[PDB]
Amino acid sequence: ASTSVKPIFSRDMNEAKRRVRELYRAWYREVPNTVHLFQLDISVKQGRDKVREMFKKNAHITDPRVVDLLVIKGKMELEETIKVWKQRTHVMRFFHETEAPRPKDFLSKFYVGHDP
Amino acid sequence: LHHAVIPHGKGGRSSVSGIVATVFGATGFLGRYVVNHLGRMGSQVIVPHRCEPYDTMHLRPMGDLGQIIFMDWNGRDKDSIRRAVEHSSVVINLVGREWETQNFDFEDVFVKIPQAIAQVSKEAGVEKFIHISHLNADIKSSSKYLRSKAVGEKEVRETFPEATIIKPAEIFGREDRFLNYFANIRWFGGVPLISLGKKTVKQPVYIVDVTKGIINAIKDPDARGKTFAFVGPSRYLLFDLVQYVFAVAHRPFLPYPLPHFAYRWIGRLFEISPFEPWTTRDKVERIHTTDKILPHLPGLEDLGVEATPLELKAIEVLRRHRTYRWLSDVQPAKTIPTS
Amino acid sequence: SRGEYVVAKLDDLINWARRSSLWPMTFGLACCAVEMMHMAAPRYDMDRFGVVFRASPRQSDVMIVAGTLTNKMAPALRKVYDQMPEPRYVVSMGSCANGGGYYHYSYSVVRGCDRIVPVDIYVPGCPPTAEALLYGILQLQKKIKREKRLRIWYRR
Amino acid sequence: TRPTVRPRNDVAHKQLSAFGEYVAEILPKYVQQVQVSCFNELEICIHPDGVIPVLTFLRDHSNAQFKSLADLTAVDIPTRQNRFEIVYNLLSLRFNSRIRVKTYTDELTPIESSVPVYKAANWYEREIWDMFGVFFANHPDLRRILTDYGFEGHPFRKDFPLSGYVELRYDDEVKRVVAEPVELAQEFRKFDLNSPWEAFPAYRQPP
Amino acid sequence: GVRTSPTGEKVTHTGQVYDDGDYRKVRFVGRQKEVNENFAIDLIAEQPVSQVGSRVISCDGGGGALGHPRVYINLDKETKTGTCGYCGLQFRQQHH
Amino acid sequence: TYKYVNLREPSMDMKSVTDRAAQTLLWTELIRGLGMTLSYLFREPATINYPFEKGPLSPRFRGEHALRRYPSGEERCIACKLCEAVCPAQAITIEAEPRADGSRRTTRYDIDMTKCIYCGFCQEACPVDAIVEGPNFEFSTETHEELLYNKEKLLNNGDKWEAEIAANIQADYLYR
Amino acid sequence: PTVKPPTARKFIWTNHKFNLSGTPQQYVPYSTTRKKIQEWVPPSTPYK
């Protein structure tokens, strides 16, 4: 009635999580190629840790429709890296190498400015 | 009161950090990274220059509209120094050449000029003053580059008692003349080395580490009147440091020993060049001067800077010396244990 | 002689050659590129000033950024700039390349090409007339004429 | 007749009304509402499941022959449960007429892809996904078309800010173009322009 | 008129000038500060007061449609002169 | 009504076929295109001698901005901010306050000439002909910061181009 | 101008100046407004 919704690809978290793992392996196997094709200065260890970091931000989702969209955006991002539609600048934007470390504790945030 | 400019913003390009810095020698190698860091947080930077205005164009994109201001100055004109520093709150000195010209010698660029800048800075009310010396500065050293370094270092400390003095080791980076120097020796076949490089120990440091230390010395109020010593986290034999460089570049490494006098005779030959000499007798002495261990001076960890290993950042410096793209690795050179 | 005299005259010669044989590399991006074409048309004929119609990055001496620089295009512009042999000058043409112009506040536009490359002449207008761009090029030639590369070397 | 008022064409208002009922009687399973505007444009409001049946009928039926997809776009109205309105504009060269077909979806419900009906809907649906995030199922190649690679968010949504979240710059330390949080030397100035006095009584809503 | 501050910087017609210790003065080193020499408050003070013989006079700045919107100025008060709100021309009534 | 651009059938008589064979083997149409480029060689070129000759303009030309004055030297601008409201690129910034004599005048008047789309809407909106676009189009600069005009820069343009600006307005104000 | 001279006015430049870019006479932007917030000046004389 009110909770009846059309699905994207997956009908329950079991099928959804299946697609997540298929995506994780695809990204895991690709990092060595990306670090070598783009001549990146990072190591393969950092590349796979960054992939893990992106998968663990969304570990709290429980809506299969939302999980499907996260995977769909993941496959598009993967296709842009395998086919080299991206460039070395785009790949290195997951690491934020030019931004200073913004403080996370109350005192430091209090000294610099008014933002919480 | 007419200072403490009250920084505003989120520490970005269009923010205001409250630093008005006059960076002498901003058009070289170390200056290229200091202006970049100062301008990355919205700092007012005054850049005196002696070169052609065309040679300062790589600095303009480093700051927001109106933040980088260029002026003419002359090393022997105290008035031109007065104009550049009278509005600033920190003066950074990076002047220095690796060879002697027909109009400036090691005495002029490492003793007189740093003394003139320091004296004028004092008389203008500049609070902070950063001066760069060498780790191996000593008045009993064969290299005349390092003898005048020690004289100037002490001469600044008297004129500006509250000045901060930094003493880095050899610095490696994209525009360096340390790793890039151990790659163009291939032009002459083998790689000469005094005592085969087994009698020399080097402790290279990363350019960005030196840059982040300078910035943090400006903000830190405890760095006034305090001397420092920046060094990387590993010591190397000159042989295995040069061996590593040729391995990363995939070039054929052919070393052969050479007596000290012979190496200085070829050094004499290259100094004849009326342009930037490829090498000099002073370059041979410093490259073969074992880096001092100064355990009584604070290092980079006292400024909150984690030293970057030379293995991590050696590839980016030496990629352009390879003769292939996508070659396909090199193992680290042995690190001399501490103590 | 004095040495300075010889250096002064050599500076004039090399400056004369460089400002008399400018070969631009037009980055025709948006509407400002149509006016750049009209500066090559018969009425103005930039070829008569020594400015060839077009060239490739390896044989070009001046880049003319004429149009809106998007975030998707900025990396491409920088790589072309880095591959120009030196001396290399940049001319920023129009409000879009100067400071963002009509699309200054858009999410997808670089606010002035000077955030990506160093600029030498800023030509205003939306678009600048083909005469304004010609005035900009002639102003760059005077800037090259004032260069003192060899004098400063002699006093090093 | 008044020189300054648009003349009213009553004949074309009558014809499009008849065809609107005609279409509503032939596809009752999907059509939810049919209206004609005062400048003679007809709108058919359908259920999102009827995208393929309705468009196929209007393209193939002898009395419709709408063989050109003029435009396919979307509109974002956050006050609705289904915030996305997918609009199809069609043209019949045979009968020299135009019709507009509208449906609705939300962030998570995928609409069916009309590439099998009109091959022109290929890129238009890539533009909708890129700028609004509406997913079209069974699309041959669905990906961003107008935004920068790696762009996060869907710019044409009403809640996406005008200047965005990141801006590009060249950094000389890393020797490449980097992205950083956006800061503006001059904040965009917002103008409150609406007059507090009602202008068009004919469109007044119930209290 | 144009006047100089103790440090030597010219004061603009709006009253703007940088303090002695302000760091923003460094933008003028090797360059100049652009100030208009024709302060408008002084020039409009040099115009004679026009004598008219009616209670209400109208001003349009001169030039007809090249001027400013036409405004009618009341002149009953005899302790001051009616002033045009757009252009600043003053008017006075003839001894009454 | 319509016409056929390319609906033709070549004649197949031996006379016409031989004509096409002569064209194929003797390059007749190619040698007829050389004549058109030979004639242009002997026509006078259309190039003007810049900067000693200038392309024609008109009184309505939209060029560099300028703040104007009344003939008495008073500023025309009365800080109404209509130009700021209609500028489609938001390139005008204005602050105001009563002047020492009590008049309504501006303290800040900035035009960011790198945002401006040189459209003219500011001189249409102005009710006192204070902001105009003069005829200057030769004001390119070597720095971005020189194209951020403030009120002092704009009044200098008006005091510098008033002889010409006043004439152009005289020749076009009856069309407005 | 010889046949039809322009209207003369007292505030018009009597000496034309050309493009001054790249010279010590170049225009340099600045804020024409005065300071908005005034801070408190502490007393010059002690208390205890």
Ligand SMILES: NC(=O)C1=CN([C@@H]2O[C@H](COP(=O)(O)OP(=O)(O)OC[C@H]3O[C@@H](n4cnc5c(N)ncnc54)[C@H](OP(=O)(O)O)[C@@H]3O)[C@@H](O)[C@H]2O)C=CC1
């Ligand atoms: N590079 C390294 O490995 C080390 C650096 N240092 C010292 O720190 C400082 C940083 O130098 P660095 O950037 O690394 O190397 P650079 O040689 O590239 O620095 C050159 C800078 O100093 C200027 N300069 C040289 N001579 C003069 C002079 N007579 N008058 C005016 N300016 C002059 C140059 O101006 P211009 O370009 O116009 O000629 C330029 O701005 C130096 O003192 C250096 O000795 C200490 C230990 C290691």
Ligand code: SF4
């Ligand atoms: S500045 Fe004007 S003419 Fe030039 S590209 Fe931008 S909008 Fe088009």
Ligand code: SF4
């Ligand atoms: S011409 Fe148009 S864009 Fe430029 S300042 Fe005037 S209103 Fe704004």
Ligand code: SF4
């Ligand atoms: S519209 Fe005219 S009078 Fe009003 S603020 Fe703008 S320039 Fe001044």
Ligand SMILES: [Zn+2]
């Ligand atoms: Zn008036």
